[PDB]
Nucleic acid binder design. Structure first.
Ligand code: TTP
Ligand code: CA
Ligand code: CA
Ligand code: CA
Ligand code: CA
Ligand code: CA
Length: 902
DNA sequence: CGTAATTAATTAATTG
DNA sequence: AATTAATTAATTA
């Protein structure tokens, strides 16, 4: 097989590499890598190396990496550019793997682990590690085994062995319900003392050294705790054994508070799953505890136990260990669904970077671009210092707040990356500037043509047309991968809807789910067989379809993120190819494109309807337009339609056969106007929205910019079995909004768009009536807890203290003096509740750590003094008032003449 | 060390 | 309560 790296480090003058060799075995080598850097040389000197602008370079080959670094510094003292890859391990990888890497994941040791630490005096700080480690569960992907290291004897209690028999039993049998599919995969090792547990863990680590190290909060807790505990007991050199090269870096981090240190293990790639989740999930959660995320992702019940965690080992060691193991499994279950490890490996190997560098799109793009240029013997420019400067972004249209009955939306495919490709925007393709006219002059096609030679953006930039820049070339490659996966995602989604339809009439039999590839639209024979399936088979298939869709979604959305991050990197000072002329050429072109096509769409529809000056485009943001279709529907008459799906078909057909051709013509003209390299402005139909035929639903509404709701029947080719609410920006979409309120507001909106005014009034009346029975967590607001210290004056709110910070300060006073009560962690999330006047907490609100029950000491008082009236007005009535006034509806039935009868 | 546009909630100070 | 400036949090794209 083809070889691939596992890990790479620079340690002084050595590269330490772990790799899989041609036979599929893991090896390590230390290489005295001799790096090369480059300097400009005279034009009349023969060389094969050129910088990105075509200037000739001479190669400087150094005896070691230290000399290369010292040369860089001397070139600074002289005042001359030092060209080439200054990150020597990336040059090493490029030299050693001068080909497209084909990796085999089954050869990569992916370790998932978690530790338990009993602590009587509060949270066990990793940098102190003063408490014994009493449990470690370490899953190894190669063995497919959970290795359980259990401490039977501790200063905090002596316990009996964990029983795998009880662990397997149902909770109703007094067991721990450890999933049966992992029971056989557990290797249980009990220990008489902590020293031997840790010594054996380290020997184990030595034999099964993680390549990818993951788990939940392992970067901030497990890794620092284990390192420091071993350091405290055995000395530093023994702790360093967690690195295969015996080198570590301790950093008492310095950017915004937090002096609790993170440990870098050389020769290991740490991908903390919390960080993977935060970057790649496209969620913002109210809480990031494993219980909360597990429940959200997998629909598994919370891990339940009596008493505080500080007494769990002592009171119920059996459950203590069982839950440690389950915790480890849950991360694996989340990854089976989300596939962030797969994504990280794909991205890392494609770019040829340390896998952990996937968190940095700048590093990722620096390496991709470097490798691409190196292929042609081109030399990358030196990184430079830049002051941070603001620059202009997208255009957002001010919508008229209103109900909108029939809406067809259109959307530009992968806009900013397509602009890069269309215009040919790259550091080395800059050809010059032209004299800009005001933007609206380009929008209206009255400004003079920017250039008859070069490809142009309305910000004034000109680009060469003779050849594609490295940025367009490389962004194109990742875009095409993205497109392939989006195609799989959409097919799985369409397939999901076929299954839902068939679920309306399940057959009465014992059968099995069909063995199908869900990434492809079901064939006619599959569709026929589905119509004969049982509910159980159909449900399992739906689950599988939806799992395929999620897999597709991860692969596609994160490749979209990567390409959009290349645009973003052009606007970040730490990017080697940072250039505000390029970033601004992209955004300015976007503003023109949107407004240009708004004008064209209005012109086209005014023609086809025989009107003049009618505004058909009601809204747009960045790259999307929302077109009112009321007149289109009214031209045929609602009476002609058999059902909802009939007008949805009509609009779908009108969009595809009439509007899209016109839209294409308009963008082709714009391309010629800007003299661009390639027409890549593709604006396809996104949404078809409207009320159910014959209903009193309003269909949709806008309250303002980035705040709207639509009742959608079809989304980019997916015809829904049930209409789906597309709600953007409103309180239902915000993690800060109480869960019960999100739900209730979503139902108000549903009733508005699908059923009408009366249905909404009926529901509101009921919600207001029953509101007070709702669980306190369900009606708590959520916020991030930043800068607590700044606003803390003696334990009371300082000037300008934010509402949620006040809540925290109240909480601190309430629990002050208690070492064991949950502390609010700076930068973490908190639940927030209003408090009625005259309460014992001495303020108007209380906040506590999110995802948790409030400590039992003050729970009864919070529940007693919760201000339900303030909660209702602030979180529910206020936004609903906003929705309904924008929609011209009343959430409460107003008086009428009819009130004088019966 | 990916980006900008934009919203709502909030505090402080004002709005004769 | 409204409006205005400044902060904060969180979205849409
Ligand atoms: C979501 C997102 C968008 N944008 C910018 C760049 C996008 O091209 C532009 C439009 O956003 P989107 O319409 O959300 O996405 P897209 O057009 O790039 O890709 P597609 O529609 O095919 O899924 O907004 C970012 O810069 N960063 C982001 O994270
Ligand atoms: Ca735990
Ligand atoms: Ca788009
Ligand atoms: Ca689309
Ligand atoms: Ca059937
Ligand atoms: Ca869009």
């Amino acid at each position: 097989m083809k070889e691939f790296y596992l890990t790479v480090e620079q340690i002084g003058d050595s590269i330490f590499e772990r790799y899989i060799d041609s036979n599929g075995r893991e090896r390590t080598r230390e290489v005295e890598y001799k790096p090369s850097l480059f300097a400009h040389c005279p034009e009349s000197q023969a060389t094969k190396y050129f910088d990105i602008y075509g200037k000739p370079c001479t190669r400087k080959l150094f005896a070691n990496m230290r000399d290369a670094s010292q040369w860089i510094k001397r070139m600074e003292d002289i005042g001359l550019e030092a060209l080439g890859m200054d990150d020597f391990k990336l040059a090493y990888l490029s030299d050693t793997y001068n080909y497209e890497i084909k990796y085999d994941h089954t050869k990569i040791r992916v370790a998932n682990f978690d530790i338990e630490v009993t602590s009587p005096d509060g949270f066990p700080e990793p940098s102190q590690a003063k408490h014994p480690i009493d449990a470690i569960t370490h899953y190894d992907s190669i063995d497919d085994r959970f290795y359980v290291f259990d401490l039977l004897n501790s200063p905090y209690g002596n316990v009996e062995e964990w029983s795998i028999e009880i662990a397997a039993k149902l909770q109703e049998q007094g067991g721990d319900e450890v999933p049966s599919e992992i029971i056989d995969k557990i290797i249980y090792m009990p220990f008489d003392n902590e020293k031997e547990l840790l010594m054996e863990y380290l020997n184990f680590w030595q034999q099964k050294t993680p390549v990818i190290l993951t788990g939940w909060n392992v970067e901030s807790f497990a890794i620092p705790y284990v390192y420091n505990r071993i350091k405290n007991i055995f000395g530093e050199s023994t702790a360093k054994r967690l690195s295969p090269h015996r080198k570590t870096r301790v950093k008492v981090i310095e950017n915004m508070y937090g002096s609790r240190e993170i440990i870098t293990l050389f020769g290991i790639s740490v991908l903390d799953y919390i960080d993977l989740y935060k970057k790649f999930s496209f969620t913002n959660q109210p809480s990031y505890s494993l219980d909360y995320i597990s429940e959200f992702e997998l629909n598994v019940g919370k891990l339940k136990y009596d008493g505080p965690i500080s007494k769990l080992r002592e009171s119920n060691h059996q459950r203590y260990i069982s839950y440690n193991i389950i915790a480890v499994y849950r991360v694996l279950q989340i990854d089976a669904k989300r596939q962030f490890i797969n994504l990280s490996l794909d991205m890392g190997y494609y770019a040829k970077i340390q896998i952990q560098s996937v968190f940095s799109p700048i590093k990722t793009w620096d390496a991709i671009i470097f490798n691409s240029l190196k292929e042609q013997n081109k030399v990358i420019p030196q990184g430079r210092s830049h002051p941070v400067q603001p620059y202009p972004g997208a255009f957002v249209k001010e919508p008229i707040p209103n109900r909108y009955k029939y809406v067809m939306s259109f959307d530009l495919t992968s806009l900013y990356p397509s602009i890069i490709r269309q215009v040919n925007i790259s550091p080395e393709t800059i050809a010059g500037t032209f004299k800009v006219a005001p933007l609206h002059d380009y929008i209206n096609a009255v400004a003079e043509r920017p250039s008859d030679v070069y490809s142009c953006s309305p910000n004034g930039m000109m680009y060469y047309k003779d050849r594609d820049g490295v940025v367009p070339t490389e962004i194109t490659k990742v875009f095409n991968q993205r497109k392939e996966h989006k195609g799989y995602m959409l097919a799985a989604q369409r397939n999901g809807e076929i299954i839902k339809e068939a679920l309306h009439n399940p057959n009465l039999s014992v059968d099995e789910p069909l063995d199908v590839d869900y990434r492809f639209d079901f064939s006619d024979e599959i569709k026929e067989k589905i119509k004969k399936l049982s509910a159980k088979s159909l449900n399992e298939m739906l689950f599988r379809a939806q799992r395929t869709e999620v897999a597709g979604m991860t692969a596609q959305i994160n490749r979209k993120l990567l390409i959009n991050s290349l645009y973003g990197a052009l606007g970040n000072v730490w990017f080697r190819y940072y250039d505000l002329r390029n970033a601004t050429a992209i955004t300015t072109f976007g503003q023109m494109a949107l407004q240009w096509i708004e004008r064209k769409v209005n012109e086209y529809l005014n023609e086809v309807c025989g009107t003049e000056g009618e505004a058909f485009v009601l809204y747009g943001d960045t790259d999307s337009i929302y077109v009112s279709a009321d007149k289109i529907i009214d031209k045929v008459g609602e009476s002609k339609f058999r059902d909802t799906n009939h007008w949805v078909d009509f609009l779908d057909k009108f969009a595809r056969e009439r509007m899209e051709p016109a839209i294409d013509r308009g963008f082709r003209e714009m391309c010629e106007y800007m003299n661009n390299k390639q027409h890549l402005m593709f604006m396809d139909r996104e949404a078809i929205a409207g009320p159910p035929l014959g209903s009193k639903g309003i269909g949709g509404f806008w309250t303002g910019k980035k705040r709207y709701a639509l009742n959608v029947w079809d989304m980019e080719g997916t015809r829904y079995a049930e209409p789906k609410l597309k709600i953007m920006g409103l309180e239902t979409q915000k993690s800060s909004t109480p869960k019960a309120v999100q739900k209730a507001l979503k139902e108000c909106i549903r009733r508005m768009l699908q059923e009408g005014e009366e249905s909404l009034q009926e529901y509101f009346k009921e919600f207001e009536k029953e509101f007070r029975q709702l669980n306190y967590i369900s009606i708590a607001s959520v916020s991030s807890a930043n800068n607590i210290a700044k606003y803390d004056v003696g334990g009371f709110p300082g000037p300008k203290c934010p509402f949620h910070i006040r809540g925290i300060l109240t909480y601190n006073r309430a629990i002050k003096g208690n070492i064991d009560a949950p502390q609010v962690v700076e930068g973490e999330k908190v639940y927030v509740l209003p408090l009625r006047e005259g309460n014992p907490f001495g303020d108007k609100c209380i906040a506590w750590p999110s995802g948790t029950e409030i400590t039992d000491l003050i729970k009864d008082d919070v529940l007693h003094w919760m201000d339900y009236t303030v909660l209702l007005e602030k979180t529910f009535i206020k936004p609903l008032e906003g929705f309904t006034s924008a929609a011209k509806l009343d959430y409460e039935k107003k008086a009428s003449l009819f009130d004088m009868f019966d």
